Design an enzyme around this catalytic site. Structure first.
Site, short mmCIF file in Angstrom:
data_model
loop_
_atom_site.label_atom_id
_atom_site.label_comp_id
_atom_site.label_asym_id
_atom_site.label_seq_id
_atom_site.Cartn_x
_atom_site.Cartn_y
_atom_site.Cartn_z
N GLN A 218 0.95 -1.18 -0.05
CA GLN A 218 -0.10 -0.07 0.01
C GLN A 218 0.81 1.45 -0.02
O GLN A 218 0.67 1.94 -0.86
CB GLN A 218 -0.92 -0.03 1.15
CG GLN A 218 -1.84 -1.05 1.27
CD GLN A 218 -2.36 -1.25 2.70
OE1 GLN A 218 -2.79 -0.48 3.45
NE2 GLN A 218 -2.41 -2.65 3.19
N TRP A 219 2.09 1.21 0.73
CA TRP A 219 2.91 2.30 0.90
C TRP A 219 3.48 2.69 -0.52
O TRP A 219 3.37 3.76 -0.79
CB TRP A 219 3.95 2.03 2.01
CG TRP A 219 4.76 3.13 2.76
CD1 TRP A 219 4.99 4.28 1.96
CD2 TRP A 219 4.94 3.39 3.79
NE1 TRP A 219 5.69 4.97 2.97
CE2 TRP A 219 5.55 4.40 4.12
CE3 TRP A 219 4.83 2.43 4.99
CZ2 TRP A 219 6.06 5.12 5.28
CZ3 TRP A 219 5.28 2.87 6.34
CH2 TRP A 219 6.02 4.00 6.71
N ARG B 240 -3.47 7.70 4.81
CA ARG B 240 -2.85 6.78 5.61
C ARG B 240 -3.21 6.98 7.08
O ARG B 240 -3.79 6.40 7.87
CB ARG B 240 -1.46 6.19 5.34
CG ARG B 240 -1.13 5.89 3.96
CD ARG B 240 -2.03 4.91 3.28
NE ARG B 240 -1.91 4.72 1.84
CZ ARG B 240 -2.34 3.96 1.06
NH1 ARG B 240 -3.15 2.89 1.59
NH2 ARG B 240 -1.95 3.68 -0.17
N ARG C 44 3.48 7.10 -5.56
CA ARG C 44 4.50 7.15 -6.77
C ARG C 44 5.32 8.57 -6.56
O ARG C 44 6.55 8.43 -7.29
CB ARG C 44 3.84 7.11 -8.05
CG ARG C 44 3.14 6.07 -8.49
CD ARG C 44 2.23 6.14 -9.27
NE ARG C 44 0.95 6.74 -8.87
CZ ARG C 44 -0.12 7.48 -9.67
NH1 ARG C 44 -0.06 6.87 -10.76
NH2 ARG C 44 -1.17 7.86 -9.07
C1 LIG Z 1 -11.64 5.66 -1.19
C2 LIG Z 1 -10.56 4.92 -1.68
C3 LIG Z 1 -10.81 3.65 -2.50
C4 LIG Z 1 -9.63 3.26 -3.14
C5 LIG Z 1 -8.26 3.85 -3.04
C6 LIG Z 1 -8.24 5.15 -2.66
C7 LIG Z 1 -9.29 5.71 -1.93
C8 LIG Z 1 -9.09 7.20 -1.16
N1 LIG Z 1 -7.31 3.28 -3.88
C9 LIG Z 1 -5.84 3.89 -3.70
C10 LIG Z 1 -5.42 4.57 -4.77
O1 LIG Z 1 -5.55 3.94 -5.83
C11 LIG Z 1 -3.92 5.09 -4.47
O2 LIG Z 1 -3.10 4.03 -4.50
C12 LIG Z 1 -3.60 6.04 -3.63
O3 LIG Z 1 -4.75 7.16 -3.26
C13 LIG Z 1 -2.26 6.80 -3.69
O4 LIG Z 1 -2.52 8.29 -3.38
P1 LIG Z 1 -1.85 9.57 -4.33
O5 LIG Z 1 -2.42 9.16 -5.55
O6 LIG Z 1 -2.09 10.57 -3.60
O7 LIG Z 1 -0.47 9.17 -4.27
P2 LIG Z 1 0.92 9.36 -5.46
O8 LIG Z 1 2.19 9.40 -4.71
O9 LIG Z 1 0.69 8.20 -6.49
O10 LIG Z 1 0.32 10.74 -6.15
C14 LIG Z 1 0.51 11.99 -5.43
C15 LIG Z 1 -0.03 13.01 -5.95
O11 LIG Z 1 0.70 13.40 -7.23
C16 LIG Z 1 -0.49 13.33 -8.31
N2 LIG Z 1 -0.25 12.32 -9.24
C17 LIG Z 1 0.89 11.42 -9.16
N3 LIG Z 1 0.90 10.28 -9.98
C18 LIG Z 1 -0.07 10.81 -10.92
C19 LIG Z 1 -0.38 10.39 -12.06
N4 LIG Z 1 0.24 9.29 -12.73
N5 LIG Z 1 -1.62 11.02 -12.65
C20 LIG Z 1 -2.00 11.98 -12.08
N6 LIG Z 1 -1.85 12.67 -11.11
C21 LIG Z 1 -0.75 12.01 -10.54
C22 LIG Z 1 -1.63 13.45 -7.50
O12 LIG Z 1 -2.06 14.74 -7.23
C23 LIG Z 1 -1.53 12.80 -6.40
O13 LIG Z 1 -2.53 12.94 -5.39
C24 LIG Z 1 -7.55 2.08 -4.47
N7 LIG Z 1 -6.19 1.57 -5.19
C25 LIG Z 1 -6.48 0.40 -6.04
O14 LIG Z 1 -5.78 -0.13 -6.50
N8 LIG Z 1 -7.75 -0.22 -5.90
C26 LIG Z 1 -8.97 0.21 -5.11
O15 LIG Z 1 -9.92 -0.54 -5.19
C27 LIG Z 1 -8.80 1.53 -4.41
N9 LIG Z 1 -9.94 1.79 -3.53
#
Ligand SMILES: Cc1cc2c(cc1C)N(C[C@H](O)[C@H](O)[C@H](O)COP(=O)(O)OP(=O)(O)OC[C@H]1O[C@@H](n3cnc4c(N)ncnc43)[C@H](O)[C@@H]1O)c1[nH]c(=O)[nH]c(=O)c1N2
Ligand SMILES: Cc1cc2c(cc1C)N(C[C@H](O)[C@H](O)[C@H](O)COP(=O)(O)OP(=O)(O)OC[C@H]1O[C@@H](n3cnc4c(N)ncnc43)[C@H](O)[C@@H]1O)c1[nH]c(=O)[nH]c(=O)c1N2
Ligand SMILES: Cc1cc2c(cc1C)N(C[C@H](O)[C@H](O)[C@H](O)COP(=O)(O)OP(=O)(O)OC[C@H]1O[C@@H](n3cnc4c(N)ncnc43)[C@H](O)[C@@H]1O)c1[nH]c(=O)[nH]c(=O)c1N2
Ligand SMILES: Cc1cc2c(cc1C)N(C[C@H](O)[C@H](O)[C@H](O)COP(=O)(O)OP(=O)(O)OC[C@H]1O[C@@H](n3cnc4c(N)ncnc43)[C@H](O)[C@@H]1O)c1[nH]c(=O)[nH]c(=O)c1N2
Lengths: 218, 217, 212
Positions: free
Chosen positions: A73-74, A172, A78
């Site tokens: 999950q961590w 988290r 990205r």
């Molecule tokens: C209610 C709910 C439910 C779920 C999930 C989340 C939540 C809130 N997730 C988890 C989700 O897919 C994801 O892994 C996390 O929200 C990662 O957080 P960030 O995107 O903020 O981190 P990350 O470090 O990836 O991105 C940080 C920030 O940078 C931006 N960003 C980075 N890379 C980007 C890109 N390629 N395009 C656009 N913006 C980008 C965004 O602003 C983002 O908030 C999930 N996961 C899953 O696999 N299956 C599931 O069923 C669910 N269910």
């Protein structure tokens, strides 16, 4: 030196930090060169109006020991740097996360919580023993390890900036996240608050979307 | 706080750094724990075999003063943090990059290189004066500034890790890049070499794709 | 190809799109699938599960003055390829604000005189550029005297999540008017291709003011 123990064998250790609250102030004004009341007001202003980019100039390096289910999950975050222990440059170790019976207290179970702990301990012992038997028989580690459970501990270095760390805390450090990663996020928040008190206070005040950081004192 | 002057009025100043060569060693082994020969061998190993991720744990912060044409190319490097001076939190300044006649020496020109320098100064003086006249007349800054030339200096903070900095050096510290950005990249490489001698030496030895870093000391 | 004209000579043209609202539904469920699907889009948006929206991608062809492009290119979570003149013909046009742009500000000289003064200095800078080019000065040096209103062209490949972040910042009255016009065109094309996602974005996640 900050090292907080988590779960039964985990930890969150601070390896290094670049900057403090003033690094965000310096990046926003674009000046090296200050004034606590004015700079703290700038930190709050930046947070309140969504100018988050100055917070990217505060960087942290952590050394985390966590089970694979927590690490999976961590590693979904990205916008960060990761380097996990694979056994190519240092010694590989084998430990597992056995949930204590207190973890199950709250769920109506047909068998005692203690018995659940026992059953979990038992199957990981069997899987680990099977792994060692396959290793002893000449099966390569990459193949033999596939039978090991998701509670196997792993270690990694995490280099992340304060903006991405705040996104991690929103997701988290919240009751909707799994209890195990909530514990890890509380340790991250504790170290973050220690190094960036103004940024952390402004984050709770203006940008924090979760719930447990406003109830639990870090 | 190393500073290197670039061009007539620009600079590259080191604001902060997190780590050194050992930060990449510590990240590769994943241990917060005395053999320089063994540690330097690991740095070279990582660089030869393309295991670049440990180098992401060395971070730099730079304060850069550069003309907008140089900054536009620099800002194309997405794997980094930037915060440019806009005038919302600090004083805005107006200076311009005037190339020296030596910049044109090498190109056969019909007019002397000093005349090219003069023609460029003339344009920035007129455009800047026009800007001030429009400002004095009540035209908002966001509108009046659109007449200012691409050689207008700007300032920004750049937070970048050693892996992304090495990608920047591959592209900008090279004769195919514009001379102005090559100078800026040479200053970045100089600061990088000072803080990470082992990583910089290994980068030139195995990963560096450009040409000017292997000629210029 | 959708196309919206912006300013005197610029534009926002839709080159290509991958997916629609159902691409976010399919990514969230990890499946291949009406009232339930729209309810899921709204649910995802109100709870901050934004990652499924990353599976909708757009490609735009944008012609904008350098002052607008500089702010646009600050959005790192996207792909860009700007016209440099190495593989195709380079062109030289400039954004001259109409007198209506100045109406609202009390000025000492008429707004038509401001428009004239702006055309004049850009004509002089452009003529100086051509003189230096004719004299054998390399383009990379001669171009440094060109003003910030010089039009440039670029291809922008961005996903719906990053596009929504762009709209939050640029489709807002605090952004420069010229930037607001480009963000309105991006929002218009986005609404056309992803009506449910756009409506949900407007309803729960949108922080700006001009789109409402
Ligand atoms: C209610 C709910 C439910 C779920 C999930 C989340 C939540 C809130 N997730 C988890 C989700 O897919 C994801 O892994 C996390 O929200 C990662 O957080 P960030 O995107 O903020 O981190 P990350 O470090 O990836 O991105 C940080 C920030 O940078 C931006 N960003 C980075 N890379 C980007 C890109 N390629 N395009 C656009 N913006 C980008 C965004 O602003 C983002 O908030 C999930 N996961 C899953 O696999 N299956 C599931 O069923 C669910 N269910
Ligand atoms: C020889 C060898 C040995 C190992 C490993 C690799 C190699 C080549 N790895 C795997 C490695 O750490 C890495 O996770 C994957 O190769 C992913 O590659 P990228 O980071 O290039 O892809 P990714 O898709 O993440 O990024 C693509 C490209 O974007 C750039 N990039 C993205 N994010 C960046 C950032 N934050 N800073 C700078 N540039 C960034 C880089 O140019 C990169 O090539 C590893 N892993 C591990 O955990 N332990 C191990 O022991 C090993 N061992
Ligand atoms: C021969 C030649 C010719 C040209 C150009 C380059 C070269 C080498 N350029 C410049 C080029 O398009 C680019 O803007 C810079 O070289 C930035 O390089 P990176 O993308 O590697 O840096 P950046 O720092 O943005 O990324 C670092 C690394 O991360 C990865 N990366 C980051 N974001 C990614 C993403 N979204 N998808 C995939 N990988 C990603 C890549 O591995 C990359 O090397 C150009 N530019 C232009 O606009 N027009 C032109 O005509 C030309 N011409
Ligand atoms: C009130 C106010 C005031 C200002 C500014 C903004 C605002 C809202 N800006 C603009 C700002 O610095 C920035 O360029 C834009 O807000 C771009 O937004 P993102 O970073 O979200 O887009 P981008 O496309 O770069 O990233 C999209 C998302 O990915 C994440 N992200 C991407 N890269 C990341 C990284 N390296 N680390 C962490 N997260 C990352 C974030 O979640 C981000 O929202 C600014 N600019 C400036 O230079 N000087 C100024 O003075 C100001 N002033």
């Amino acid at each position: 030196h900050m090292k907080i123990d988590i779960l039964d064998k985990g930890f969150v250790e601070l390896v290094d930090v670049m900057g403090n609250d003033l690094s965000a102030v310096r990046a926003a004004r674009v000046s090296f060169d200050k004034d606590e009341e004015r700079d703290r007001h700038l930190i709050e202003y930046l947070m309140k109006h969504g100018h988050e980019t100055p917070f990217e100039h505060i960087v942290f390096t952590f050394h985390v020991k966590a089970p694979i289910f927590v690490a999976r999950q961590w590693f979904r975050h990205r916008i960060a740097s990761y380097n996990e222990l694979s056994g190519r440059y240092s010694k590989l170790s084998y430990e597992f996360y056995i949930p204590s019976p207190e973890r199950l207290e709250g769920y109506k179970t047909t068998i005692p919580p203690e018995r659940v702990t026992e059953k979990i301990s038992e199957i990981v012992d069997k899987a680990y023993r099977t792994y060692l038997e396959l290793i002893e028989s000449g099966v390569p580690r990459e193949v033999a390890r596939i039978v090991l459970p998701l509670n196997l501990y792993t270690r990694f270095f995490w280099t992340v900036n304060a903006r991405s760390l705040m996104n991690f805390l929103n997701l988290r450090a919240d009751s909707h996240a799994q209890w195990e990663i909530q514990q890890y996020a509380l340790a991250i928040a504790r170290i973050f608050k220690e190094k960036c008190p103004w940024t952390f206070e402004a984050f709770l005040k203006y940008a924090y979307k979760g719930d447990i950081l406003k109830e639990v004192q870090v």
